[PDB]
Ligand binder design. Structure first.
Ligand SMILES: N=C(N)NCCC[C@H](N)P(=O)(O)O
Ligand SMILES: [Mg+2]
Ligand SMILES: [Mg+2]
Ligand SMILES: [Zn+2]
Length: 889
């Protein structure tokens, strides 16, 4: 397996100036004719001409209209087409080819493939070479003129990049459309779509040049009335890039297309964005609430790529975080401003500190700009995206809004229309940093370490207050654990947004302040501090670190009640829960290890329970925030703090802590579940397809969270409430009624009722499957076998496979059954899946990422299953590289 190294980057000895494609789609085959107008570059040294081309069936290849001869003039090995240099021209020339490919049997969903009755391409990162020969790398920029033909009845709508310049009939019931896209682009941004697509459309007029832009959103006919929210999101996304960044769309039309079979999220092909149906289609009747935020996020993200990815492009795939981390950051700024709820930021932090921190302490740990890869398919990770986003957001924290905007505009102005690397971004921000500090000797060289250093920094604190001098000191230390990528970790430039809270009245004691920690340790002193403060540290989660606040639980409760920053309140709550979890886990572990016949458990802090009740009862406090405070930290966050984690002991620890709090608060929870009904479930705008209320959906989250707490607790008569909830018009509610009924005899009755409500909408059925898969059932293994036999079957749809299996892998008691049966079951599904879709097979490996964090028995059981997968003769290259790296082999 070939290893690609970042420092080995060299420009091609060839240039491709023009691609002219003819893609003729037939019932049993698609024929692709391509002419590349090429040249020799200044880097050329008389080498062979080598094109990528994977899985292509050659009819013929030519140079300047003469056929080449296999063996004597070229070799093709199903991966690389090599033309010996003696036959390669020394000036401008045409290379032409005709190949056959088979989208109907392309179940890997890369290249050109059939999803239900739509033909669609997916080219990022290396899928264009599955369609035709190319030097398939993003620095090869070319013009594209593309013709597509097909059966007109089956494929009436034909789309590609650029302007549609000709439409024509063809004998035999066929038709054709030609699209010409003169601006240069990399091949990964090519797309084509053919299908019987229906649409909604609108015209958008840009803010400054007043250009009319036509917006089209497409799906199959069945679901066309689920497109309205996506169109509203697209308008919002355009407005926001205009408003915050001063950036307008440059083209005359933007198409969005929903397909049923897609490998996660969406894809930013220029003017032709293609989406997983689950991230474009929603209705109030047939979608859970989460779909609304998801579509806003994904439409926004693909829109924002038009500048950060499509106009300023990547030099090579090592720079992936430059488009993805920056687009995720732009996405996050947009979602925060659109939802106006503090839970939007919290949800991003919750994801990073569970999923991405687990990655970064695993054998898979990498920096956001990796140094090498085998499969670029395995580097579209939470590290590259979500830690990359936190690195891109730290420049805004460090600079502030005015100077961040100036630096960003520097980056855009200087690199628009050209390839770029992470350095070019850092350079732009530095120029803004020089301006901000008012000193041209200031630099961000140290900041570059966020791109090259792997692992999560730990930041810890000590304090000092001198009452006579009114002088307060914060002593800060940073440390990153050595790992396989750096033996010696260096200190990072860590911005620490801080406040100082007066514990007597809850007031701010200082103005906005961001500490710039640039050494291994530093002491920040503040004078004229009239009373000893409680420090509010890392406001907004201002760096992607482990925060060790060293505060007492009394101080944490005071921040939780009285601080002004949502993250710090949520984090204080999280730190109270973690101290309790680690204490009880160790008490349970000692009792299990010592086989004790009796033992004691430390109860949950009473003043902390009181603070929760105080917040829940405040009618002016935010419902989405309340749902976070009554929830323990995610299991994947907890595991970062425990060695040899026994999953049964952790399950017993969580049970204890939830029961301790419920034994005090369940009456409060029931009262609020009832008092929240009116506003949470208000149907006033149910038939208004464009009216989306994030606060109201957070009220439903809180009700559904409280309903789960009450059901687990077997609160008196709560089944009455579960049954009534099953009758709600909102799928968030009636699917919740299914999951909480797991604890009652009524579960299979609601299973049938909710299946009936779900089975006729493809996406809603997938949400039903996730609900069943995540259900806290003692008979979950029998239930999964029933889903496999009755509903899933031999579906190759990624959404169906992921819905059936991934939520189950989060079932702490049962997936981690000590027999290893859960690990065995997922390994079988991975290997089965890998035969047709190696990307999804790799996604289904996710529970294995924490294998070396668990108790020694479960470590062995997981390792056994990974080695069994590795031993499969027919293992894919993507699955093999992934499991070798995960198992340190
Ligand atoms: N290899 C993959 N996971 N697919 C790449 C497509 C990712 C898109 N650029 P996005 O980040 O916009 O969803
Ligand atoms: Mg083939
Ligand atoms: Mg289907
Ligand atoms: Zn992206």
């Amino acid at each position: 397996p070939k290893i690609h190294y970042r420092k080995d980057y060299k420009p091609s000895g060839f240039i491709i100036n023009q691609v002219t494609l003819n893609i003729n789609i037939h019932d049993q085959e698609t024929i692709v004719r391509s002419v590349l107008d090429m040249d020799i570059s200044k880097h050329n040294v008389g080498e062979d001409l080598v094109f990528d081309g994977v899985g292509l069936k050659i009819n013929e290849i030519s140079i300047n209209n003469k056929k080449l001869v296999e063996g004597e003039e070229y070799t093709y090995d199903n991966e690389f087409l090599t033309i010996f240099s003696k036959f390669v021209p020394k000036s401008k020339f045409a290379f032409s080819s005709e190949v056959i490919i088979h989208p109907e049997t392309n179940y890997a969903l890369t290249g050109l493939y059939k999803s239900k009755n739509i033909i669609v391409s997916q080219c990022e990162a290396t899928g264009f070479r599955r369609i035709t020969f190319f030097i398939d790398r993003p620095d090869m920029m070319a013009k594209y003129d593309v013709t597509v033909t097909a059966d007109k009845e089956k494929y009436p709508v034909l789309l590609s990049n650029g302007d549609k310049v000709n439409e024509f009939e063809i004998p035999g019931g066929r038709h054709g459309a030609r699209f010409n896209d003169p601006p240069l682009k990399p091949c990964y941004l090519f797309a084509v779509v053919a299908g019987d697509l229906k649409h909604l459309s609108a015209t958008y007029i840009t803010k400054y040049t007043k250009k009319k832009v036509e917006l089209y959103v497409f799906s199959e006919e069945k679901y066309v009335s689920k497109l309205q929210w996506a169109l509203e999101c697209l308008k919002k996304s355009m407005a926001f890039d205009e408003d915050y960044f001063g950036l307008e769309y440059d083209l005359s039309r933007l198409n969005l297309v929903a397909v049923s079979d897609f490998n996660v999220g969406a894809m930013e092909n220029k003017g032709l964005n293609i989406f997983n149906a689950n991230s474009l289609l929603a209705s109030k009747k047939n979608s859970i609430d989460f779909s609304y935020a998801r579509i806003l996020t994904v439409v926004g993200h693909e829109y924002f790529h038009q500048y950060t990815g499509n106009r300023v492009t990547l030099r090579d795939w090592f720079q992936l975080t430059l488009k993805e981390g920056l687009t995720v950051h732009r996405e996050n700024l947009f979602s925060e401003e659109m939802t106006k709820t503090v839970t939007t930021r919290l949800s991003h932090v919750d994801l990073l500190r569970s999923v991405q921190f687990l990655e970064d302490s695993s054998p898979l740990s990498h920096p956001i700009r990796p140094e090498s890869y085998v499969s670029m398919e395995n580097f579209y990770t939470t590290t590259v995206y979500d830690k990359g986003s936190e690195v891109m957001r730290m420049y805004l924290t460090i600079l502030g809004e005015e100077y961040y905007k100036k630096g960003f505009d520097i980056y855009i102005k200087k690199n628009d229309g050209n390839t770029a690397t992470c350095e070019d971004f850092n350079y732009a921000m530095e120029q803004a940093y020089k301006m901000k500090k008012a000193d041209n000797s200031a630099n961000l060289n140290q900041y570059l370490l966020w791109f090259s250093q792997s692992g999560t920094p730990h930041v810890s604190f000590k304090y000092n207050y001198d009452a006579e001098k009114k002088q307060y000191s914060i002593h800060v230390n940073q440390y990153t654990k050595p790992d396989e990528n750096q033996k010696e970790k260096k200190p990072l430039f860590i911005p620490i947004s801080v406040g100082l809270i007066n514990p007597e009245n809850g007031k701010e004691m200082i103005s906005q302040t961001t500490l710039e920690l640039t050494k291994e340790s530093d002491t920040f002193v503040f004078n004229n501090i009239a009373v000893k403060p409680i420090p509010s540290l890392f406001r907004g989660f201002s760096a992607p670190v482990y925060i060790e606040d060293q505060l007492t639980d009394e101080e944490r409760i005071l921040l939780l009640k009285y601080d002004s920053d949502a993250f710090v309140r949520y984090n204080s709550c999280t730190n109270i829960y973690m101290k309790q979890i680690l204490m009880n886990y160790n008490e349970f572990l000692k009792a299990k290890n010592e086989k004790l016949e009796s033992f004691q458990l430390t109860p949950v802090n009473a003043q902390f329970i009181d603070a929760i009740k105080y917040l829940l009862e405040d009618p002016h406090a935010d419902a989405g925030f309340k749902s976070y405070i009554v929830s323990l930290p995610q299991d994947r966050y907890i595991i970062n703090f425990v060695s040899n984690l026994d999953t049964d002991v952790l399950a017993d620890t969580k049970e204890y802590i939830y029961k301790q709090i419920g034994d005090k608060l369940n009456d409060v929870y029931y009262k609020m579940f009832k008092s929240l009904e009116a506003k949470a479930d208000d149907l006033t705008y149910f038939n208004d397809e464009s009216h989306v209320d994030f606060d109201q959906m957070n009220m439903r989250t809180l009700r559904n969270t409280l309903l789960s707490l009450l059901s687990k607790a077997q609160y008196p008569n709560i089944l009455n409430e579960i049954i009534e909830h099953s009758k709600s018009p909102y799928p968030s509610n009636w699917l919740t009624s299914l999951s909480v009924s797991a604890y009652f005899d009524k579960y299979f009755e609601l299973y049938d009722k909710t299946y009936k409500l779900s089975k006729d909408d493809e996406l809603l059925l997938q949400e039903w499957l996730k609900t069943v898969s995540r259900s806290d059932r003692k008979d979950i293994y029998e239930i999964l076998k029933k889903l496999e036999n009755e509903v899933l079957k031999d579906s190759k749809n990624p959404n169906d496979i992921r819905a059936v299996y991934l939520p189950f892998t989060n079932n702490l008691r049962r997936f981690h059954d000590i027999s290893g049966k859960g690990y065995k079951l997922i390994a079988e599904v991975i290997t089965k899946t890998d035969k047709f879709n190696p990307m999804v097979a790799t996604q289904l490996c996710e529970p294995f990422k924490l294998w070396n964090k668990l108790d020694t028995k479960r470590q062995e059981l997981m390792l056994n299953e990974m080695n069994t997968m590795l031993q499969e003769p027919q293992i894919s290259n993507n699955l093999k590289e992934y499991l070798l790296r995960l198992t340190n082999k």
